[PDB]
Design an enzyme around this catalytic site. Structure first.
Site, PDB file in Angstrom:
ATOM      1  CB  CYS A 173      -0.930  -0.027   1.243  1.00  0.00           C
ATOM      2  SG  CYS A 173      -2.033   1.562   1.270  1.00  0.00           S
ATOM      3  NE  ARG A 230       2.351   0.590   3.352  1.00  0.00           N
ATOM      4  CZ  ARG A 230       3.576  -0.029   3.688  1.00  0.00           C
ATOM      5  NH1 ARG A 230       4.146  -0.460   4.681  1.00  0.00           N
ATOM      6  NH2 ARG A 230       4.284  -0.133   2.378  1.00  0.00           N
ATOM      7  CD1 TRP A 270      -7.170   9.327  -1.680  1.00  0.00           C
ATOM      8  CD2 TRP A 270      -7.819   9.421   0.456  1.00  0.00           C
ATOM      9  NE1 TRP A 270      -5.970   9.807  -0.863  1.00  0.00           N
ATOM     10  CE2 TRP A 270      -6.677   9.791   0.488  1.00  0.00           C
ATOM     11  CE3 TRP A 270      -8.937   9.460   1.691  1.00  0.00           C
ATOM     12  CZ2 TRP A 270      -6.291  10.157   1.838  1.00  0.00           C
ATOM     13  CZ3 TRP A 270      -8.172   9.770   2.756  1.00  0.00           C
ATOM     14  CH2 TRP A 270      -6.849  10.143   2.797  1.00  0.00           C
ATOM     15  CD  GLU A 322      -6.201   2.566  -6.785  1.00  0.00           C
ATOM     16  OE1 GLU A 322      -6.465   1.328  -6.241  1.00  0.00           O
ATOM     17  OE2 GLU A 322      -6.344   3.430  -5.869  1.00  0.00           O
TER      18      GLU A 322
END
Ligand code: HEM
Ligand code: HEM
Ligand SMILES: CNCc1cc(OCc2ccc3ccc(N)nc3c2)ccc1Cl
Ligand SMILES: CNCc1cc(OCc2ccc3ccc(N)nc3c2)ccc1Cl
Ligand SMILES: CNCc1cc(OCc2ccc3ccc(N)nc3c2)ccc1Cl
Ligand SMILES: C[C@H](O)[C@H](O)[C@H]1CNc2nc(N)[nH]c(=O)c2N1
Ligand SMILES: C[C@H](O)[C@H](O)[C@H]1CNc2nc(N)[nH]c(=O)c2N1
Ligand SMILES: [Zn+2]
Lengths: 413, 408
Positions: free
Chosen positions: A111, A114, A283, A288
């Site tokens: 991720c 973070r 969000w 992506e």
């Protein structure tokens, strides 16, 4: 394992030192002779297995609140032990649940988001007993997290696994996703990623609108029972029509996307306890949607259409027509979310924040496990700072884990 | 065990057995992956390494266990006994050099691995001789723009006090100069090497693209400076097929990528000077060389001429300019009939190469972190391809820069 492992940033020459790897819990899949860093994925705990996992977690928790070795620490240990002894499991305190959830996120090596880990709203849904109840909790989650476009990170945690035959599961891979429909001629309408799940929903009774952007229903399993279908109130589903600041024709493509990315098929492991239904949301990072969702061949696959509209030479790959269209699409996604005041972050801003987060973690925590293969964005890699950053990957607990799709394991009643 | 790798786009699954052959370490452990870390003899050590290599050679020509195979082993054994080393046959040198390329996990261009011209330079004794061998290599490989892959192999390491080394990181590179105002003229990657050349007597023109001299070390002696004949250095002025102002940027680059600072290891033997060359993938120049912040760093200038809104990152002005620069590079080489491959075509070929290797060899060691191009990653087929990385020998290895070891 060496006490100190060093990572270098080849752009800034900054060298960081990792000691946190000594707390590594599980195996990565790699060995001395092989690396599986690009492999995507490389019956319950017995009493004896559960004891040391719980102690490890409780110790970590009391160490975090600066009460390590305290009377409260020792009393909590004893209480957890007696509970495992007499019930083969134990219940987390609310504080522990919250700490555990935040840290599973803090530990998620894949991720890039973070830096936000400590700002996570945790919804305790461990009192839930039915699919309708799951639906209620999920609606509240979606509403809170969406916040009219000002997105807030959140997780809703349903009852932990007991004997493995009473699992709570969200069958959806994300709370909000679009249906995909295979056509007799072999073509696909909507999102090809979701064809199988869509087919399951239809079989369970869902009447499909058969459009290109149909929000899938929730398919929810409580206490190991057969899953049940629910329609998310459409007013709870925030969407953004995609348009482009320069190309007026872009809106004529009819593209839109949903604002809330809410992954719902992962397992949260805390202190040996397993929370098989723990939907969480943050969000979006623009790529992506703009790179993966829109431009993957196996997804919406819009590159050709966009390139055509852009009047590019699509005869030779060396014209870089694909690369050119890809950027314009990602420009459109960011511009459309920002214009509608829906939280989104571009890949430059996100990766720059992550570098700062990583350096802070190395300094306050002794390290920051990170999966380069996932952290580096799917476009323009080397013009983001993460490309030049050496990383170390390892698994700390609490953690988010993959789990098999429930339709492959479920015992239909 | 047999390991499977899957392509998540095509769903093709391949089965790897070849990894079972590896004996060198990757750097990872069961608990820690170091996949993104850039850099993670004696008679007694020498023979088993030699034997391992001779065995695979004789297996490769389907004469494993033959009289010739057995004789070669004894020959090598005696030779190690009486000289503490051994010498490869020409056939073995060529086989080993091609396999070092074949085994290079980080190289996307390996579909070409068996087409490699091998220049045996093991009879070389002086820096002048090295210069000669290198000029011949550059001339052959360049071939008026129709580039041919080649490697020139200088004598192997003996005691470690008599190393042959090319001090340049590539045969052809541009100088970099520190400026009074703290900025950098030319290639910042080569500032240190440039300073050494200057101290050793090279007279710098102090331009933005000055071809560096060769600095060559033979038999552990101090290195010597040589100027590559300019007619041997093929260069390409960078222009854009649409933006006529792009040429006014005054960018150029050289045609021949010729890496000269790696170490070639074959059968326990170490070749510390083994310059090799192929041809470029466009992004090497257009993304890394031109757009790395620590390199020519031209994104800002280009985005300006494109009149982009450079105020917020989310305008993707960097991404837009990056594409145009890589279009220009490809267009420029192609127009001048200088061999170059785009990242789409290259990664496609690599996927096909992988299929070939799994079929004929049982696998292909591959480093995803390096194989995936530095731009437009997931619209190339390698992004979605699971790879297994493991180390096979013969191999190319990193080695320390010679100015950190050399006593003058
Ligand atoms: C707050 C804004 C956030 C951003 C911008 C962000 C960004 C990302 C991105 C871009 C990925 C890669 C996605 C992909 O390619 O599939 C990812 C993966 C991941 N994220 Fe975050 N994230 C955010 C919040 C969160 C939260 C709240 C959690 C959990 C509480 C989380 C946990 C994870 C995990 C476990 C993965 C890896 C999933 C996998 O292995 O499939 N993230 N994140
Ligand atoms: C013929 C055309 C070739 C192409 C298009 C090609 C392409 C590439 C590219 C793009 C890289 C990444 C370089 C970087 O990012 O710095 C690479 C790495 C590499 N290549 Fe190739 N290559 C070719 C030929 C060769 C040849 C002839 C050899 C050796 C005989 C070779 C050996 C290697 C090695 C050892 C690396 C990794 C270097 C390292 O680990 O730092 N390649 N290749
Ligand atoms: C479907 N691709 C694999 C996969 C990805 C998953 O997560 C992607 C993911 C997870 C969390 C996120 C949080 C925020 C965000 N913007 N994207 C996020 C994206 C989860 C399960 C699977 Cl199986
Ligand atoms: C330096 N040479 C000594 C030495 C010889 C060794 O074996 C020599 C040798 C010679 C001929 C061979 C033929 C076949 C075979 N399988 N092994 C063979 C091995 C092994 C280790 C050492 Cl240390
Ligand atoms: C400087 N980046 C790391 C590094 C790369 C190196 O080689 C990159 C390399 C090697 C061989 C190549 C062959 C052909 C080609 N087009 N590029 C090629 C690029 C060598 C040493 C180091 Cl330290
Ligand atoms: C930190 C990281 O390993 C380093 O930046 C790598 C990433 N991938 C790369 N890939 C290629 N082809 N070349 C490189 O120099 C690098 N650099
Ligand atoms: C084969 C490879 O591991 C796979 O395509 C990975 C690559 N990196 C990724 N990185 C992110 N963020 N998301 C992904 O789905 C993937 N896919
Ligand atoms: Zn690894």
């Amino acid at each position: 394992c060496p006490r100190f492992l060093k990572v270098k940033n080849w752009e800034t020459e900054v060298v960081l030192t990792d000691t946190l790897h000594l707390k590594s819990t599980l195996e990565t899949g790699c060995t001395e002779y092989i690396c599986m860093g690009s492999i995507m994925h490389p019956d319950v705990a017995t009493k004896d297995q559960l004891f040391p996992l719980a102690k490890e977690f409780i110790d970590q928790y009391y160490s975090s609140i600066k009460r390590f070795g305290s009377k409260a620490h020792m009393e909590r240990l004893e209480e957890v032990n007696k509970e495992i002894d007499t019930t083969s499991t134990y219940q987390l305190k609310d504080t522990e649940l919250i700490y555990g959830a935040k840290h599973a996120w803090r530990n998620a090596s894949r991720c890039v988001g973070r830096i936000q880990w400590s700002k996570l709203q945790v919804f305790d849904a461990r009192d839930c007993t039915t699919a309708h109840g799951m639906f209620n909790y999920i609606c509240n989650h979606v509403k809170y997290a969406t916040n009219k476009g000002n997105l807030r990170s959140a997780i809703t945690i349903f009852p932990q696994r007991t004997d493995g035959k009473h699992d709570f599961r969200v069958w959806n891979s994300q709370l909000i996703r679009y249906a995909g429909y295979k056509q007799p001629d072999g073509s696909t309408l909507g999102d090809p990623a979701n064809v199988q799940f869509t087919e399951i929903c239809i079989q369970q009774g869902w009447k499909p609108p058969r459009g290109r952007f149909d929000v899938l229903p929730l398919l929810l399993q409580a206490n190991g029972n057969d899953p049940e279908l629910f329609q998310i109130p459409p007013e709870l589903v925030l969407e953004v029509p995609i348009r482009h600041p320069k190309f007026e024709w872009f809106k004529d493509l009819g593209l839109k996307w949903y604002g809330l990315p809410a992954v719902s098929n992962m397992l949260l492991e805390i202190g040996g306890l397993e929370f098989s239904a723990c939907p969480f949301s943050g969000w979006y990072m623009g790529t992506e949607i703009g790179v993966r969702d829109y431009c993957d061949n196996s997804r919406y696959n819009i590159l050709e259409e966009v390139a055509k509209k852009m009047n590019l030479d699509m005869r030779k790959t060396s014209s870089l027509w694909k690369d050119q269209a890809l950027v314009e699409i990602n420009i459109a996604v960011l511009y459309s979310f920002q214009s509608d005041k829906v939280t989104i972050v571009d890949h430059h801003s996100a990766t720059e924040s992550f570098i700062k987060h990583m350096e802070n973690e190395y300094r306050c925590r002794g390290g920051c496990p990170a999966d380069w293969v996932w952290i580096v964005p799917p476009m323009s890699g080397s013009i983001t700072p993460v490309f030049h950053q050496e990383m170390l990957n390892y698994r700390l607990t609490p953690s988010f884990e993959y789990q098999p799709d429930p339709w492959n394991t479920h015992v239909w009643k």
